[PDB]
Design an enzyme around this catalytic site. Sequence first.
Site, short mmCIF file in Angstrom:
data_model
loop_
_atom_site.label_atom_id
_atom_site.label_comp_id
_atom_site.label_asym_id
_atom_site.label_seq_id
_atom_site.Cartn_x
_atom_site.Cartn_y
_atom_site.Cartn_z
CB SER A 215 -1.03 0.01 1.05
OG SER A 215 -2.24 0.73 0.96
CD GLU A 348 -5.05 -4.92 -4.14
OE1 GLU A 348 -5.22 -4.15 -3.20
OE2 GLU A 348 -3.97 -5.41 -4.27
CG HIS A 468 -5.35 -2.85 -0.08
ND1 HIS A 468 -4.63 -2.57 -0.95
CD2 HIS A 468 -5.19 -1.91 0.85
CE1 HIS A 468 -3.49 -1.69 -0.52
NE2 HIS A 468 -4.08 -1.07 0.38
#
Length: 567
Positions: A215, A348, A468
């Site tokens: 990230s 995600e 994610h």
Amino acid sequence: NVSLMEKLKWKIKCIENKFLNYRLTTNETVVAETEYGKVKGVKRLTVYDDSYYSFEGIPYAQPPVGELRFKAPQRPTPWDGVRDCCNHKDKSVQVDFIAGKVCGSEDCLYLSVYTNNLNPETKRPVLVYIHGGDFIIGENHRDMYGPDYFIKKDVVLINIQYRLGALGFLSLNSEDLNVPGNAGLKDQVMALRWIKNNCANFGGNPDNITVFGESAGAASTHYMMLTEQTRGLFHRGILMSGNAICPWANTQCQHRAFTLAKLAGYKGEDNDKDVLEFLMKAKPQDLIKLEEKVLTLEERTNMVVFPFGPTVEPYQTADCVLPKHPREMVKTAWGNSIPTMMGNTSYEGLFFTSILKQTPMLVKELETCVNFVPSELADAERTAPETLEMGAKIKKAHVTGETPTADNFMDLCSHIYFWFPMHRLLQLRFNHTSGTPVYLYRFDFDSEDLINPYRIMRSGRGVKGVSHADELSYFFWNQLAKRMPKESREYKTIERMTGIWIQFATTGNPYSNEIEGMENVSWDPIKKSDEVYKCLNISDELKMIDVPEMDKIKQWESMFEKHRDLF
């Protein structure tokens, strides 16, 4: 966003984890050398009865307090005697992702070093993890980033902290004030220099350092591969679900210091000198608490993601990290010439489940999709026919039924924030490298038997799909983890993910026939001539596949057909 029931369960887990960590602590301590003085660490166990030496709270910079607030990090003061590194230090000042209250300290410029053997028979690959959290949350505490899985193998693992929020990312135009921006990225630079200079004291090989992050940590790793400040400092990079050309990964925030100051009680005019003097006197908790209010109505309208973060610095300084936009930095980046691996999870955008439940009207943005057109292609009002036509292309890519749905929205999010910037980076970078290999993975393993705190943050209990940050459970022990059976699909996934990362860190090639289930894998890096990307898909099996997202990626790219200079 987090329910009262989940906050109670989290508190109970925090307490249970504290006592588990006592039971995993041995009575064996050890001293290691650093360039600034000796450090004392402790031998710890894992729930699998592996063991490792743990050094936490190693300073790599002076505490950035007083006149050093908002400044580039400075080298720490050396000490005589032995510094106690048997416990963690504070995290950077931030709003707790579950409790919703400010926590942490300005005294946060530390790194942690872990290894199963301080005097190994051969110098070891050094893996350096840069945490994510949008440049506003995160830490190197082992309740989220436990080294317990990596230390099964013969590597040195290092987890860094860096300044967050306005304390890490304030930027002022006035050269005389020496606050150009990117203090938190400069913290990362200083940590990487420390690692090069000191990892050998822990059994590491300074000629074989790999930086990885997820990230905002992936954007950070990419920034560390782009800036001249770090040229030659490391040898492989892994970008997990992000990079430095993602739309969320940078912003021009030079005017926002005044706005923050006013929210914090400033009564003066908008000039950098007077604004800075006020911010230098503020309590750090007050600044961080008010950050969520800083973006103006106009900036929210323009879809600015965060008020403070990495920025193009307005003037040059000795420590400058980003002198130009990252897209331009790619053109001359030293890190284009080191082995690189990139990837994403298979869903995600599932990260936004809670947000869509709270505001289902968000799905109406899919009616025309104009708000998702890249800003460099859209007219200012987002009403021009050409902009509507680009929005229609996005809509065709993601709206699969008669009426747009929340799942369509979340699929779109996977592309706008992760897959499309990855594609754009690969294509830009191919023009500025000499055959150095890049490898793609896709993390596609779904389980709720082994989770991590991001699932709580996103209210994802009982939600199927690989969101994610779900892969972090297979890299790091955390306080929600449990011991898994050796034959379990989760345990095998830990072995495979850590094994592939260690293999790549070692050799620059992620394939090894010693990784179970990987014997029949032929994993080629992406070539400039490839029209369809191939990736290693990690599910219950390891298989090379055409990236399933490719068709949608191509539909996003089609928006640039008449504007190829901007792609």
